[PDB]
Design a protein around this ligand. Structure first.
Ligand SMILES: Nc1ncnc2cc(-c3cccc(S(=O)(=O)NC(=O)[C@@H]4CCCN4)c3)ccc12
Ligand SMILES: Nc1ncnc2cc(-c3cccc(S(=O)(=O)NC(=O)[C@@H]4CCCN4)c3)ccc12
Lengths: 494, 464
């Protein structure tokens, strides 16, 4: 890497994603190629989330990518929010279409006409569906690989229930899974919370979210969201049923929306990435251990050394360790070391002639760089132990970094100074869209930051379920105009 | 509805009542419900495992292609141009230049391939992606849709020999998907110049036969693109021997789509609904209480799960057993396992094969052995029934008279063929229309073309 994370974050990130062979650029702005190395991380997330949502009775399906103008516009505030971000198809080949069709930014308006048909009685509920698909949003934002892309891969779950209580329970169940995806797969701590009125999903009653923190830039980012849509969509799409207990009266179904994207991968890079490259949490690493021959003798001797490497490979494969042996003749060991370091492989396994004769090998951790000499027979258990430990250290390091960078302020003045220290702050909040808009403008106007940093106002992240402090009985919004409703997390963001 | 009568009405009834398909307000777009999507997942699980053994890696490229990139190979762009959907505005803001939704990702991927190949050390590159594509004939669920799910594999090699091997390896994997998984026989073959992939040297294909409509359909294709794209996209490496000599990479691309599920429906489906090949069925056995009773059902559930039989126990109280019979029947579950009091008392149960409707009383102790044995038999039966069907409906013919007669009886036929595009072009006109399906690798028989003017036996038929 030429660039350093502390010196220039953008250049560092740009170098990490390309040199790790995760991302390649496209000639369409905001669109990035997910090379195998990146894609494998997404596949690992998929394997885990899928198993978990199957336990909850959720089933996979595939809905069409195209939505009609009529369907898109059925729920009025939802379409109002998304109409500018929607890409329109207006012609096939040379023929203009009679009616333009929209690429889904989100599949509520695609799926709910089908839900209307399928729900004929109360027995038809609940309906729990999920799809893994691509979606396109032309947002007015600066695009960054993974974090903010014009096209993105995601999953979207859409559920429908007879009662609000049943729907409410699912929301938090999904939000916990997302937390698990971040915390125990990616070793990233998150803050569960409820979005404010201004930042909540258009068309839902309420939105839950997980917020992650990137130490380097001092900014927070949304990891995933789970919404309760109430009956806003069911009244518009006529997803209705007759309650046995309430004769002759049509009930509207209660609905939830939940989504998680390839943004995760960017967050993982920003949080754990270092100046030697990418750092993969062992849980999501395509390759957990890479075996490299050293000290390359006769043709027979070279073959035997290769055979030793491949035996290690077999041993690790048998204990469910994901392992590759880099046996290429064309690259020197040193080249290989750097290459795999750049890609963030958790463990490098070094094997030379002297080590083979001595019945030992060298393990090098990616997180710390600790070199360690292990006995040949203790390979499975020791490396398994090291991998388990790398995961904990990454999560531990990040948890400590989150803990100290999230603090409490009770004045606008206090809020400003801490924010400009590269921190996120829980403040007492009115909850009004006016309070929030004013804060955005003010935190930017009064901001004091380093010579390069551009003007960036703070926005709400979430109203935490578990705030650091309880709200003082008579406390007021930092604006001073009205009383505080809840402690709310605020910060610079994406 | 009935298959032998109104086939279009029958097909619509089967895909909806099996809960595979729902209709959409955009023409030629159909919702894959879980039941349909599970088959695709089963297909994907198999095929994905197989291509990994060959060193293929998964990835994801963008859905959008620039006008410039799409036009780089003139043959390829000319053929695809009329069926490309164009995005021209986001919200109410007209784009400076239109961008196209991919009908296929050759023109999206190969610019990247050019950058990643600096030496012959960088080859081979073998990438697959599971994604959707859009191609704008009247739409049919599964068989001919405006949007469809597929995999597309794109490979690049230093040598032609290496590429040629993979083409046929992939083709055999497609054949396995159809034959081993879906119990559908297919004909491996080569496309003619007329019907080959635009921008490729040669196209291999598997052909499946839908008896009901007397129509053939391409199951999957594998192309050797040779140097046609690499020349246009400058995917080059330095000659290892000759200084200052550029070499062009040899390339292949291969694809399989959700059309498989349509072919499965049309071939094995009957008048009682959908029939699922057990190998690809997410629910192999369904247990239904008839007439305590539930505990015995669960023992069966547990016993079957232990031997890797995919089983569901429908112990719902709010639907009758009669409803459940029809529901899972329409869904084509291979085996139903009825368990009522009398049979429960007598330590037995009745197993009903989906395909033949056969009823068998089975001792409790022999469930794992017997049901597994039944599943394999249904799979073989299905393949055997369709094999025979194909043999009857595909024949040899040497004259337009004999040929035309066979085509009129809803069959496909292998004919000696000139190979000329115009002869083929003529053939369609005369027969209306019958098109070339493939030149079989293993033709039935070993002369002059039907046009009488001027190569190989070529399978011909009415096509989707
Ligand atoms: N441009 C972008 N690049 C990368 N990742 C992104 C993620 C979201 C995102 C992620 C999850 C949920 C949402 S949402 O809009 O708050 N909710 C929804 O869309 C719901 C969730 C299921 C479908 N409707 C946005 C929005 C833009 C992104
Ligand atoms: N309308 C449709 N509905 C459902 N399935 C379909 C499948 C193909 C299809 C399947 C495989 C390959 C091809 S192709 O055009 O011969 N080849 C390609 O597109 C290559 C191979 C994969 C990458 N490009 C078409 C074409 C239309 C379809």
């Amino acid at each position: 890497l030429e660039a350093k994370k502390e010196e220039n974050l953008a250049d560092w990130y740009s170098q990490v994603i390309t040199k790790s062979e995760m991302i390649e650029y496209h000639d369409i702005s905001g669109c990035y190629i997910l090379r195998p190395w990146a894609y494998a991380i997404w596949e690992a997330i998929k394997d885990f989330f899928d198993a978990e949502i199957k336990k909850l009775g959720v089933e996979n399906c595939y809905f069409p990518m195209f939505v009609s103008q009529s369907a898109l516009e059925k729920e009025k505030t939802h379409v109002a929010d998304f109409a500018p971000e929607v890409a329109w198809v207006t012609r096939s080949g040379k023929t203009e279409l009679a009616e333009p069709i929209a690429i889904r930014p989100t599949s509520e308006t695609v799926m709910y006409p089908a839900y209307a048909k399928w729900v004929q009685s109360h027995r038809d509920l609940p309906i729990k569906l999920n799809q893994w698909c691509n979606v396109v949003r032309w947002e007015f934002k600066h695009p960054q690989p993974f974090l903010r892309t014009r096209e993105f891969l995601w999953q979207e779950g859409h559920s429908a229930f007879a009662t609000m209580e049943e729907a409410a329970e699912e929301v938090l169940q999904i939000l916990d899974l997302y937390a698990q995806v971040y915390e125990e797969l990616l070793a990233i701590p998150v803050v569960k919370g409820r979005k404010t009125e201004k930042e909540k999903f258009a068309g839902g009653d309420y939105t839950t979210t997980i917020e992650a923190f990137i130490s380097a830039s001092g900014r927070a980012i949304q990891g995933g969201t789970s919404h309760h849509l109430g009956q806003n969509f069911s009244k518009m799409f006529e997803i209705v049923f007759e309650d046995p207990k309430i004769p002759g009266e049509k009930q509207f179904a209660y609905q939830n929306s939940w989504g998680l994207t390839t943004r995760t991968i960017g967050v993982m890079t920003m949080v754990h990435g270092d100046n030697m490259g990418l750092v993969l949490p062992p849980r999501v690493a395509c390759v957990q251990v890479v075996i490299i021959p050293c000290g390359i003798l006769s043709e027979e001797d070279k073959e035997a050394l290769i055979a030793k490497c491949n035996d290690y490979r077999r041993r690790l494969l048998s204990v469910n360790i994901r392992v590759r042996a880099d046996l290429r003749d064309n690259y020197s060991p040193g080249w290989k070391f750097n290459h795999w370091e750049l890609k963030g492989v958790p463990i490098r396994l070094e094997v030379g002639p002297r080590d083979m004769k001595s019945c030992q090998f060298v393990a090098v951790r990616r997180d710390t760089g600790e070199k360690l000499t292990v006995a040949e027979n203790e390979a499975e258990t020791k490396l398994q132990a090291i991998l388990e430990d790398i995961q904990v250290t990454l999560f531990t390091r990040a948890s400590e970094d989150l803990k100290t960078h999230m603090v409490v302020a009770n004045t606008m003045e206090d809020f400003q100074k801490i924010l400009d220290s590269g921190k996120i702050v829980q403040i007492p909040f009115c909850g009004e869209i006016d309070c929030e808009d004013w804060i955005k403008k003010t935190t930017a106007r009064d901001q004091d930051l380093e010579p390069g940093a551009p003007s960036m106002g703070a926005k709400s992240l979430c109203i935490p379920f578990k705030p650091l402090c309880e709200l003082q009985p008579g406390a007021k919004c930092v604006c001073g105009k009205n009383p505080a409703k809840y402690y709310t997390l605020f910060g610079r963001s994406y």
